[PDB]
Symmetry: C2
Subunit: 371 residues, 2 copies
Amino acid sequence: NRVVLVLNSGSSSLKFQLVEPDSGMSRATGNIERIGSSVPDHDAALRRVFEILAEDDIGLVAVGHRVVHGGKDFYEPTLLNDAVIGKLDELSPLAPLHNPPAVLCIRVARALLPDVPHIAVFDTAFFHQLPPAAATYAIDRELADVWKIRRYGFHGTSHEYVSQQAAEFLGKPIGDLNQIVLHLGNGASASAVAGGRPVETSMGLTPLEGLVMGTRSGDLDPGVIGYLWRTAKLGVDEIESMLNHRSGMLGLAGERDFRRLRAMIDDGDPAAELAYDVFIHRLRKYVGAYLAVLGHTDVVSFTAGIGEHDAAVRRDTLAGMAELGISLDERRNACPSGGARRISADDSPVTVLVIPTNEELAIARHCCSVL
Amino acid sequence: NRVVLVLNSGSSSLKFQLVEPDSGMSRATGNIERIPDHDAALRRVFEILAEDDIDLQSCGLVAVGHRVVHGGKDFYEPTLLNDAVIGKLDELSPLAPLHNPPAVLCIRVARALLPDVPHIAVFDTAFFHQLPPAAATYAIDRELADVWKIRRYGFHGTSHEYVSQQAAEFLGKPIGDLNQIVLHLGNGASASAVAGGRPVETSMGLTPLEGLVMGTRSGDLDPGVIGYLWRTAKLGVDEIESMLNHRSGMLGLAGERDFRRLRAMIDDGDPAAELAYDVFIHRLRKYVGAYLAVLGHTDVVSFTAGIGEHDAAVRRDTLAGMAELGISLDERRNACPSGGARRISADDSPVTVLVIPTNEELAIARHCCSVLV
């Protein structure tokens, strides 16, 4: 019956999805790409989103706005208005490229749909309460406080969601489990969650830190930027742009997609082989690091596009881990299905799951939370 | 009966040590800090050695060992120095523009004043040359990485190498049979993972700033932090990096780098000191976890260097609550005031834990004599 509209705007894109909270069904789903030839302006992106919804004959309650960065101040699903929107515009320097498109969309959206309330859900919100020892970078304290620099973390809605679904799958209270969640998508991040409360995550001040990703470097010697600047004589924006768009798997092997990368490795391409090896090794390190942080771990869950469907990634990440409590059973891991499932061996002290993520559904239920 | 003078040049300092490699005895040790210049600095050393009735022109010195921070891709063994090799070294300097040129300069001064003896350079990156490609490659643009020679080089190589040998000897097992973690915790700090004697990971990277939280260095840091300080705080690139290297770590978080002084501030209930200490320990525990996973099976973990050798509390807090990863300490063995190579794990710890005093100068002396015979 009741439906929420979840929106997600980039600088040349407006993803959308109509969704029912109480049942979980998704009434419709799209994303208007290349914005900025055929679809020029974000007003004409949401307008063209109505011609799509019309052509399938389209019981609303709210409109959910996906915002990437909530700074120190926004870590709850927040009711929007002109005053709240005001404070949002001030967050933008924390996320200079990612956030303004969602402020833009807040205002184009609320302008063109005053019927329902608009509620904002932040991708940093889940990690607000990371413990100080994990949230603090070891840099000059004054600069850190003045410029609001800490580990904020991202993929918050996904890590939270999956941790709740893992609890349910196992039939135990979220309060009694220690978990690792591995969100392997276009972007990739890891979390450690102790009793439902997050205690580490791999992304940082920005979505660049941590795991190797499609186009992002992840962890990098802090000296690399300076080196490229004073010796290669490249500009800082160029350097950072390269780190977000010309690094990771694209930078190492010339290919993002892991099914394509597989074919390249099957065909004996060394560069694709090295790139895959770099990705897996980086992830293995984060699994180990977070087992230590937790001390005792009950479950590890994979989620997101690569996590849900690449059996070779799951196998290689957790190979040779029996002395740390993890064993996979390939009969379960090698068998493609959708849905929540168990892929660990029956005698594995740590349980390994696949849990499909539904960021848009979790964003819908939170919106109700605020009503 | 025979010795090697081991030298270590900083931007304003000159550490030296005359070591018997067979003996392992240090005939003399010192450090001319403050540096008129390196020509003089080395002159002022000759006098001290004479002030203990030692004259280098006659004492069985077979070699003068020169420590260099960055060996690049091409220098990864002890390297008998001549004018050609020294011309190539100058080309490396942009890979370590602050650490290397000082050592190149002292190589000049020293080859003139001690000509009747071979000069041999040993590189702090050398041990890690052999890191597997999956560990040594940053996930950035290949072309830039290639042309600018950007990879995980690693540092504290002499120490990690030495401690991995000493650990094996201590346990009575050949080094080819052990998987090890070494935690070199000094003013600078780094971790390594060594499989049958070959390093398979280490925490420092292109430069000595990656990895662990240190005395005045940040260690691991979101690359976005630097860009953000540049475009929003509008600080210069050189200033940011200098902050990261000199005004970060424990000094940056607590205003104090010394761990005994830090201990005292913690006992007197200073909250910045306590958060600083927690940040340090949390970062270290992640690395032990990471490197346990890289190795699969780990036989031994060894602490070394100033803090690793002397701070029972750092060792206790690093490895607390790790029984499910195979590690448990024995409180009494850990608190033992006695120095020297020793075991600190419980009898029931599948992973053995050791303290191994490091002696880089001796390791370098022996490397210097490796190149002779």
